[PDB]
Amino acid sequence: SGFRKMAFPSGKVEGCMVQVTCGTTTLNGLWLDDVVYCPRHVICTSEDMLNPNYEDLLIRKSNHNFLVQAGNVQLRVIGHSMQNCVLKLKVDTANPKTPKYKFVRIQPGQTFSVLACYNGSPSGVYQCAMRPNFTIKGSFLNGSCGSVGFNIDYDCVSFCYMHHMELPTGVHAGTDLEGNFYGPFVDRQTAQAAGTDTTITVNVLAWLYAAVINGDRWFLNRFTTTLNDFNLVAMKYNYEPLTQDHVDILGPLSAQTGIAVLDMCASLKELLQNGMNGRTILGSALLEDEFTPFDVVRQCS
């Protein structure tokens, strides 16, 4: 029993964190096999950030301009290349602590663990979700760039995020491990803003099923809804549309609890209308949207 926001154990990722320095800029890098991955903006000055020509800035650098530190050991950079917004530094030592890994690009609504780092040293681990507007609500200070997001389903680490910047609203923007940004963002200090955010509907439904599994049914009702009528109501509360894919994905939880997906959709419509009336669901007075259907099945009985 119990339901917590739970992160994956971070040990396999801690053994990959290194410090990357280029001139006056210091940030974090991810050391896997004989390559260190880090944000390309490590080659920029604060001035270069408005309209940087990364190709022009990189061609002026040599291997010995990049200082890479793994614990108390200095690694030797023997090559460098840029792939999208990520810099790949070839080093002369393969990481003996390299776990089994994959690079995965995730979709909005997916969750992952973040190992927040400063100066190549891990400081904390937290769980978060890729928002529908492609930002993440992280907890990051200056020097956290290069910190990574990951999932460890089974024994393999799937790297899905690398931190690059903080937008003016305090939310964060980054890339996959191939350097492609999530969202319409660029690694430039030009005027950029997160779009209006919405609630991840399929995740709220998954979390209502987690509450039923743990014993709570106060929010259920005798009603059902069509998918179209639910979406017409949901859109008015800034909730993401629920697709047939989402309904199919909630199938196993529906079968376990005996509550059809459209019946749970009717319960969500009522909660949006009534609020909680002084009650809580799994210790929360708000509807939680940072647990996926897969997270609920993994954590719950």
Place this chain on the structure above:
Amino acid sequence: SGFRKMAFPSGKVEGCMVQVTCGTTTLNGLWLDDVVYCPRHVIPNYEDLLIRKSNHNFLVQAGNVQLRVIGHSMQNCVLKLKVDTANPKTPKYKFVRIQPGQTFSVLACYNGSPSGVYQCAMRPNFTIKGSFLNGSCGSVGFNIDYDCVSFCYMHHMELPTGVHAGTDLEGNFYGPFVDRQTAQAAGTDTTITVNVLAWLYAAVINGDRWFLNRFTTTLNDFNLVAMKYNYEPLTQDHVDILGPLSAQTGIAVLDMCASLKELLQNGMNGRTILGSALLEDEFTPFDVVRQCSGVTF
């Protein structure tokens, strides 16, 4: 910017988790130096049950390797299995007993394999609101101080309300609980006042100031009000501990207490603080300073 419930990096603890089997029971053990620590319920008159066991009855598995048990002893509610091999991954460590209101990270494990890490607090009623299923017994709670792991909790059981009970690493239970199947219940819980105040300071640091007011209060008047809402009493020690946060934000501790008093009597009025519609009490003053300064391990 941002404020998350954050756990310590778990790597130093993952390298200590092993599986302990005795008969039909399988649970988790903590392998430090040449000793494996686990709940004594893996084997009631525990001395009479233990005397009937031999070293070979305890099967200890570290990854895919079987460890050899060469001795066994009991210390309070913890079983200590002496093994032939010292853990090469043993970090610098201490065993510490924590107080209610203090927070720690839990590395939830099943079959000696870590599955998740979460942050939690020792409630004033000595239970923890964890997330545990069958097989989780032996999972540990910890904090990190520079490079030293301070082990403070070992999981033993789940109470009928879904909350959890356990011991320090010396086998002494937190709370009036016993390791046996008998009627036990968590006592009435209270809110950790000093932690709610620390969390209000974190919200201010992050630009959430709607709840601030021009008012102040005496410590006595605040405690009279706090006692009415099932909040723990705030002591002068707590006020002193919130000193640095008070100096950084410019809001005196008793000034923040007047905000807390208005929040208890009037509510949030449809608003949120750090994305929460409830007053959060599982961040200590030290947690707030650490997360709003980026201390590394």
